[PDB]
Structure 1
Amino acid sequence: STNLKDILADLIPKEQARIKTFRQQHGKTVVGQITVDMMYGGMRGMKGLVYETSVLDPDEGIRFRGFSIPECQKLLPKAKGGEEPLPEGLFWLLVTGHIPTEEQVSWLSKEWAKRAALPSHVVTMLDNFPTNLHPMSQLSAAVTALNSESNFARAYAQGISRTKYWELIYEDSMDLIAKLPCVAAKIYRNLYREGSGIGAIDSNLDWSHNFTNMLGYTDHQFTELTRLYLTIHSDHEGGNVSAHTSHLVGSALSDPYLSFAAAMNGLAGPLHGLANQEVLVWLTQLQKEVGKDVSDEKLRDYIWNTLNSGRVVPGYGHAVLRKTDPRYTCQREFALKHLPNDPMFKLVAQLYKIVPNVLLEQGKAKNPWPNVDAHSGVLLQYYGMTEMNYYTVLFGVSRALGVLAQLIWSRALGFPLERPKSMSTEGLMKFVDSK
């Protein structure tokens, strides 16, 4: 009723039968072809894996178990007095496929606050990391080191039924999620607040608020942003590098700690994890050059110049997104409400109205709309989080929610080891001369 573990135990047999029915009906059905190009092209547009938690709706953007961001914004419980969905409630939705009640989100906050304690060796490790070790590497290493607490690692050697794997994955996942804000905040403080203490977890606060307390922030609106930020970056299908990495490492029966730590290594990749930062570096450089009261005309000209130099507008480059990423839009609406006077926000909204058209005029993408990362950096900066090296850590804490929700389900459903076939160029040249 209130215990997520017992609700999930009741959901797992129905989903297992659903899948078994579909495989028994359609197992041998061909869903696509693999070309030589796809093998060289990083499996692009190859249906490679099953991932239950989120799906890209090609018009309406990401869907969390069927719910769009606007629907989640509407339906998910909020803090007392807040407007922004609690990430707890998003996690519940991912795991259960159902919208939580306020009582379920509240139980989940309490459960995460009670598991949040870090082992001493991790605190020590973190306190001893130098300033030149990037925050993401500190997060990954710390998470790896947390695997000393893994319930799941012990039990496989002990011969626990496969049928029970999901239960230990759940425990480990709940423990990791609870601990991630303490790790993330200790890294923040060590790097940027002279190693002062993160203080104490409040057993009665939601996860985002405990997290902002620990970072050393005391600004209701930043906590509101953080709630929204963690909700919306939580999951984006299974194909992206951080989700795929967690799924791949997870399929070897590595515990949630090792899976996530691997996934963060992947998120730290500058083709996955650095866009927030590149957009902000660009905006800062732009505003300083052209001043904060630049005209549309002069802005449009600057953009035309950048494009004709063979250069991209960072944060504008879409997939199949026939509209603006709803992840952008909810950040925009947030900004419109709470920081409409901010100069850099004003530059962001001005580009929004100008750049799509310029991109359509040019021979480029048929989608010229902005991704989530075009708006994220200006909001964080506004609330005093100016340490751009740390931005991807926030993304990472968010993504824990999606990849761990899916990891529980991968084990509950008994997905096997991910083990595709590779070929060399020489092999593939022969393979095609034959047949």
Structure 2
Amino acid sequence: STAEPDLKTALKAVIPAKRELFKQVKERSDEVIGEVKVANVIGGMRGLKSMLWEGSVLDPEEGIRFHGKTIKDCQKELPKGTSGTEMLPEAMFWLLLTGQVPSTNQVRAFSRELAEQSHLPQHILDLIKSFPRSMHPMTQLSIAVAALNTESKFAKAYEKGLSKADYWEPTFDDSISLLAKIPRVAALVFRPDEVDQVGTQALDASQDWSYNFAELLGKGGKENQDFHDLLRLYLALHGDHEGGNVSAHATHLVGSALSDPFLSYSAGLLGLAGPLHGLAAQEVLRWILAMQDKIGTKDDDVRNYLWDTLKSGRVVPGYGHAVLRKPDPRFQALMDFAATRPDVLANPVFQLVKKNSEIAPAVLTEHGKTKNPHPNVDAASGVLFYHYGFQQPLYYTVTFGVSRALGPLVQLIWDRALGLPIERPKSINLLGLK
């Protein structure tokens, strides 16, 4: 018999190595690694290698990787739930933060902490009851998450006097706290009539984070285990996708001024509430339902509708990437999940998604407007939730919000451990570029 370390202790063990690596990179401070062009200034920094992000790197052949591991490696190696086939988001968080795969026992102890720390102050429940029905769900989520800054250990510690070398410890604490609480907050956004019951309902401390999220959404018990596996997979896959995306970047940006994790990830959610970032899954579902509606329920069928769409100036949602040359491995992971659930395979709406994925890439290639027109993860995610009875697309981004806490919180902990300074680029006006 031997002792197994908790998440904080595992993080502490890999901190010195990262600091040694950081110090070596600093010796190369003057080394040139690229050029700033006018294109980069007016194209929202596109292709400008200008920020640090430890947890995930996009490989152009294999897609997103987490400390060098593919989605397929993660599905195989990361710990599962006490029931189910899919990898756990808490395990993904552990991997993102430490660079190492946790044992099963380590993940269970982490899950338990997350269940025990999930309760909300009374003032947050009052805040949520104040929201009108017309308020966008993503707005409700961003606000409620910011409001949890009342519970921030970092805010309080920084005010009192705190060593720069130790800024990470309170940041970690708040990150775990945020993580514990956010599923509950999301469930209250889904269920505005049940705030008092859902807001205080005790969780089963022996179950995983995704299971408990499902329970607070009204989908608990063994009868909903298929949904539990979807939710686990979905949450793990959307946790991190580099630093350049707006929710990750905004979190890093705001956090670099030493706003605590609650205020920082709030800012990330505000970016995620943007139609060009987080509402892609909702847009795809809408477009698939509109397509089913026009063709009813009739391989060659789909092609006419696609061509009709492109020749009218509209885009096919859920298709394309600027760098990835193959289908998004996260998309593939959602279809592998579908492949073993016969009932999802029999849903007409998923059948329509699947046919379109086998036909649209050829069609979009021949049309030539969009480079790398392969399905991305947003093609599939909406339909899967729709199958399990989440039929209001407005809330899809809320689920992405929960998931997307994982990666940016990890980077925030590392930003503070490494002592990274405030993000301060230099602006210029158009006249100044002549």
Q: Flag whether TM exceeds 0.5 (same fold).
A: yes
Aligned to 1:390: 395
2:285 is the alignment partner of 1:276 = no
- Conserved 8 A contact 1:2-1:103: no
Residues of 2 paired with 1:103 and 1:319: CA distance?
Answer: 40
Aligned to 1:215: 217
% of aligned pairs identical? 53
Per-residue Cα deviation, 1:159-203 (whole angstroms, up to 9, x for no partner): 10011100000000000000001101111110xx56573232111
Runs of 4+ in 1 over 4 A off after TM superposition: 193-196
Aligned to 2:233: 228
Question: Structure 2 counterpart of 1:356, which letter?
Answer: P
Aligned to 1:101: 103
Residues of 1 paired with 2:195 and 2:17: CA distance?
Answer: 49
2:19 is the alignment partner of 1:19 = no
Greater shift, 418-427 or 164-173, is seen at 418-427
2:265 is the alignment partner of 1:252 = no
Aligned to 1:312: 315
Aligned to 2:329: 326
Matches within 5 A, 1:3-402: 3-24=6-27, 26-190=28-192, 197-198=197-198, 199-218=201-220, 219-292=224-297, 294=298, 296-338=299-341, 339-402=344-407
Shift of 1:37: 1.5
Residues of 2 paired with 1:179 and 1:194: CA distance?
Answer: 17
Shift of 1:365: 2.7
Q: Which runs of 5+ in 1 are unaligned?
A: 430-435
Q: How many residues are aligned here?
A: 424
> For 1:62, what is the secondary structure of its paired residue?
strand
Per the normalisation by structure 2, the TM-score is: 0.96
- Conserved 8 A contact 2:318-2:377: yes
> For 1:172, what is the secondary structure of its paired residue?
helix
Match of residue 425, structure 2, among 407, 415, 420 = 420
Residues of 2 paired with 1:109 and 1:257: CA distance?
Answer: 20
- Conserved 8 A contact 1:2-1:107: no
> For 1:197, what is the secondary structure of its paired residue?
helix
Shift of 1:16: 0.5
Shift of 1:12: 0.7
Question: Structure 1 counterpart of 2:116, which letter?
Answer: K
Per-residue Cα deviation, 1:55-111 (whole angstroms, up to 9, x for no partner): 111111111111111111111111123111010100000010001110111111011
Residues of 2 paired with 1:365 and 1:137: CA distance?
Answer: 32
Shift of 1:300: 1.0
Residues of 2 paired with 1:306 and 1:248: CA distance?
Answer: 38
Per-residue Cα deviation, 1:206-261 (whole angstroms, up to 9, x for no partner): 00011000000131111110000000000000000000000000110110000000
> For 2:51, what is the secondary structure of its paired residue?
strand
RMSD between superposed Cα atoms in Å:
1.1
Residues of 2 paired with 1:401 and 1:194: CA distance?
Answer: 27
- Conserved 8 A contact 1:169-1:407: yes
Per-residue Cα deviation, 1:354-374 (whole angstroms, up to 9, x for no partner): 001011111223311011111
- Conserved 8 A contact 2:125-2:195: no
Residues of 1 paired with 2:78 and 2:101: CA distance?
Answer: 7
Residues of 2 paired with 1:362 and 1:160: CA distance?
Answer: 59
- Conserved 8 A contact 2:322-2:371: no
